[PDB]
From a paper:
Viruses from the family Picornaviridae form non-enveloped icosahedral virions that are about 30 nm in diameter. The capsid proteins VP1, VP2, VP3, and VP4 originating from a single polyprotein form a protomer, the basic building block of the icosahedral capsid. The entire capsid consists of 60 such protomers, arranged in 12 pentamer units. Here we show that the exit of the RNA from the particles of echoviruses 18 and 30 requires capsid opening and results in a loss of up to three adjacent capsid protein pentamers.
Specifically, we performed cryo-EM of echovirus 18 virions exposed to pH 6.0 for 10 min, mimicking the acidic environment that the virus encounters in endosomes. Asymmetric reconstruction combined with 3D classification identified subpopulations of echovirus 18 particles that lacked up to three pentamers of capsid protein protomers. We call the particles lacking one or several pentamers open particles. The missing pentamers always formed a single compact opening through the capsid. Reconstructions of the open particles missing one, two, or three pentamers with imposed five-fold, two-fold, and three-fold symmetries, respectively, were determined to resolutions of 3.8, 4.1, and 3.7 Å, which allowed their molecular structures to be built. Except for the missing pentamers, the open particles are similar in structure to that of the activated echovirus 18 particle: increased diameter relative to the native virus, reduced inter-pentamer contacts, absence of VP4 subunits, and holes along icosahedral two-fold symmetry axes. The capsid proteins next to the missing pentamers are more mobile than the rest of the capsid, as indicated by the three times higher temperature factors than the remainder of the capsid. Residues 1–42 from the N termini of VP1 subunits, which were previously shown to interact with membranes and facilitate enterovirus genome delivery into the cytoplasm, are not resolved in the electron density map, indicating that their structures differ among particles. The N-termini of some of the VP1 subunits could reach out of the capsid through the openings formed by the missing pentamers. The openings formed by the removal of one or more pentamers are sufficiently large to allow release of the viral RNA, even if the genome contains double-stranded RNA segments.
Numbering used by the authors:
A (entry chain B1): 2013 to 2026, 2030 to 2043, 2048 to 2257
B (entry chain C1), C (entry chain v2): 3001 to 3073, 3078 to 3175, 3187 to 3233
D (entry chain j2): 3001 to 3060
E (entry chain A1), F (entry chain t2): 1043 to 1122, 1132 to 1275
Amino acid sequence: VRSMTLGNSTITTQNVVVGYGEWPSYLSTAEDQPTQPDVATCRFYTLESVQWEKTSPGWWWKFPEALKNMGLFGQNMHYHYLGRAGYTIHVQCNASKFHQGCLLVVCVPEAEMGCADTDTTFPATELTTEDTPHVFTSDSITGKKVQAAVCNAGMGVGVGNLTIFPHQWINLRTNNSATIVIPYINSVPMDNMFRHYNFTLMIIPFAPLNFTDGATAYVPITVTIAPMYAEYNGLRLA
Amino acid sequence: GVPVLNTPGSNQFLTSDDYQSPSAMPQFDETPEMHIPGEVRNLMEIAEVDSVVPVNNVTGKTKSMDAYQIPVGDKTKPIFSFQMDPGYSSVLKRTLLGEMLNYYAHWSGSVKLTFLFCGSAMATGKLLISYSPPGASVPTSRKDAMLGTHIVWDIGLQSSCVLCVPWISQSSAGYITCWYQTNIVVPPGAPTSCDVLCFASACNDFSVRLLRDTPFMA
Amino acid sequence: GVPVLNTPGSNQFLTSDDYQSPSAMPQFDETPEMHIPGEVRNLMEIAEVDSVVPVNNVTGKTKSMDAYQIPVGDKTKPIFSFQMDPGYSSVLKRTLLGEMLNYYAHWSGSVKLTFLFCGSAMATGKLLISYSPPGASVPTSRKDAMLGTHIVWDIGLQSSCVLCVPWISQSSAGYITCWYQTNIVVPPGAPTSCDVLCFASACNDFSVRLLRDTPFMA
Amino acid sequence: GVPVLNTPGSNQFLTSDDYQSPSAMPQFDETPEMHIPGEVRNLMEIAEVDSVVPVNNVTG
Amino acid sequence: QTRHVVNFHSRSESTIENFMGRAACVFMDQYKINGEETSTDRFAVWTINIREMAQLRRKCEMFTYMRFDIEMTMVITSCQMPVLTHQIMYVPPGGPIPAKVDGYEWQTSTNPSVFWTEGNAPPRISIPFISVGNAYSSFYDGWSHFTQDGTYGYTTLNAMGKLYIRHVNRSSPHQITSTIRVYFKPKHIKAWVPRPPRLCPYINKRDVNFVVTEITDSRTSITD
Amino acid sequence: QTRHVVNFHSRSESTIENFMGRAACVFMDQYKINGEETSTDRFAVWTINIREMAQLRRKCEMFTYMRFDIEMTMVITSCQMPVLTHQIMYVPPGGPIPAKVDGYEWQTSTNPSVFWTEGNAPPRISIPFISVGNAYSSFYDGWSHFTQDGTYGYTTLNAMGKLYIRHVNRSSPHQITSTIRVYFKPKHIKAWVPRPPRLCPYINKRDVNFVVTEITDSRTSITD
């Protein structure tokens, strides 16, 4: 049991999957100069806990803008139009000892998702609802929204071989916590934080939750994101 | 000047050549290469990643995520059984292993399998994972599987048993059957029926030769 | 003799090549190069020269030299305001900076601005030159411009204030507004209304990549 | 570039030549050579083997 | 066939340059020589992108980011005269395009073009890494216009240019219909961020939309 | 499009040789093969000057003085026979010119000429720095004839020669109309005395005359 703290946010934790073997880092010019906030930004932003029932198909969050209303990090998105960060993501499950199940906690950089009825697009409020997660579905759906059927998560790939990305299994038999560090994968050193979704944290239950008639009918999944090494553009003159 | 003579093969266009193409934009200086995380320098770095194998791909359970779940919890018939070849096998053909191997005609190597038991922390039982050599016939009973190659995998102690199946190549393969050694013993609070996930990758190193077009795309 | 074979791309005429052209006049010996003053060895030596920027390019003052004059001498609306990008901006597109940048598609660098106050030697006042970052909105008031980036430029002390605006590139830009901090205080002999000239060049060094044809010529 | 001039015999196909053929499968790496018993490196190694001679090859 | 001892140890054919760097025909098109002075059927266009045919498109979607020089060689035929000379004009991403076969854009000095006359070896034109960013992005989970406007998934970083092709002969007594086959080839290719293979069939050439497909082919029972 | 981080540091494309040294088509012309034994439509002329088309002319007027070798490559077509052979005769500034397709000037040993037959690679002829002075002058604020006579602005130092082009075939059964496209290219170029860019449109190809144009495009107010 390790009680990590960052700024004015302390969580209680219980091995880290460093995404692509790299730890996030700063970009290191007088023509373009970055600003490193360091202060705040790095604290833990615990999202709303998500109840995992027997019939839950999955969830996804789209970052960096899932934190668009989260404190100073969600406020520096409105004043600077360029930025980058690292996003240590803790995922606890705090189930009991009689609950069973298994989760895939994967990050999927550049998850370009497909519309539900092709030949058209979706109204841009179907990919993300800032803090709250869009759930997947168990079967196919229609309408101007994301094709959120599992087995074809968002991208038209098999959902089983989604393990190629930075992932972590949460088997309630053994463990309950996951932690992933995603060192800002992008093709340009800095990009706008409202246009571009750098990665898509999606939690997918492979083995479904099961229990008997006495336990609690759900297992709350707690998501915590710490934006590390966040740096922005400069606002001062040179 | 220099007396040259054109050989057969001059002024032709061989599709697979490596000649110096005259650059259309010589003045143009391309963008400097930054370090982007997660470089691939070889395709067989994708095959070495574990990925979930749809063992329960029966006729009505392939468009849901019930394809990946092996139901555990009749001791006379095996739990599951499938050909051990990532090509031309319905179970292992759309795996990351089995999908980077359909780009090639000649491949040879070994393949490791991980069986993650996704049941309760109180459920306890034994499963017997038998392997048949590529020429041998499948075991029809649990005893005949015990007399061959097997691993009596105690679930209550460890929850993940790893194999490494050799002699996997094409240019009549093995079998990974699984048997009830014991039933799943469970206290009054925990549920009775559990699931077992499977995984597959390249075990140590994988050899692969002749590139071709994939059959899946039409 | 030497067995050669022609690759694809033989006997073609690529427009952008750097081959050894056979000289038509080989006997001819060209005139010796004398030293002529003022050699250009790089185009960005033209962009580094200051030149007057037509800020007052309103609908009827562009064919006269009233385009270059910013009238100074209502404190609620700014004196002038313009996009800070030498391409696709009416104020900075025909500058020496903005004209050597329309020959190129990818350019990135900084740009310095000099505000020469061309009023009397007795006129005294303050002007507040605010800069908005490329994402931010313009200040609607003088106080909201004071809370951002600014320089309260006292005219009576110095008559030329120099900026250096970074993050200027294309492949939604900044703003240089100017405000009456104080009015122009003037003795009984000197005139009341003054002018402010502006300038623009490359601040330290300028980066520019992809050559194209200019849009101005038809 | 280099001033060359084609001799007589350019752009012809002599059947018996030993020129460098452009390989169609350059990426392809061929199978390693194992040792197989009984290599022939010269035809006259076949002529040096005794063999039975049909001396009594009369009409029937 | 029979199961043989496939004994060797090699992964030189599995590297990225030996997997992607293969020439494939990506653009057939017809273009006439005469008639209809204001027509769009006297030249070819082909905006250069990797999402041309699904066989190559599938390989570029193994990887999220990749950068590579391209070296295309056209194969131009003709049907129905003099000896014909063609022009394959590559315009960069920032470049004017012709509207007609006799536009002034064809004479632009910043648009490199090859003038291949018939009978010789095929024309080869090579284009470096043009993009503004540091790699071409196969996937772009983002919006071109800020504040979640239209045009999902299309970034302007992975723009490669266009390829305008015409006859340079002004006219002809009879009709000549030329056919061009552009052979695209990645070169000096690097690739980052691997990605699972495509499962569903492709719908359209500018989006990732798909129909929900089954994971694998079904079998009868779990034990057969 | 969107504003990206255009991060790099390079000015190799802004040097003079990487700015001026680009091949551009500067002369299209027709010339027949037969008929009208005394006619001016059986050969081409094109007195070589930088003031040919306004796109290139604008770049040469960035600089007052410049010196450079020129390396032009013609692209010759034909319409309507035998195999055709052409002749591209460059006469120096001091050189006799033909008056007819069958003049004796075509046989002058001091006029270098290429004999390109149809079907091969395009003919390339390179011309060194001919001028009498030490540089070509883009602008000449002076009078050719002393004591302020006629012909303002035309010096004889920036004379480059002419380019007479004909068929060498004496006749033909039918009519063949050849088209030539001269691709001018400065080479090994130096440039002195920079100069502000042209603002007004061009009027005529031998003078600097212009119509008074507005400085920039107008906007509504000084503050919008």
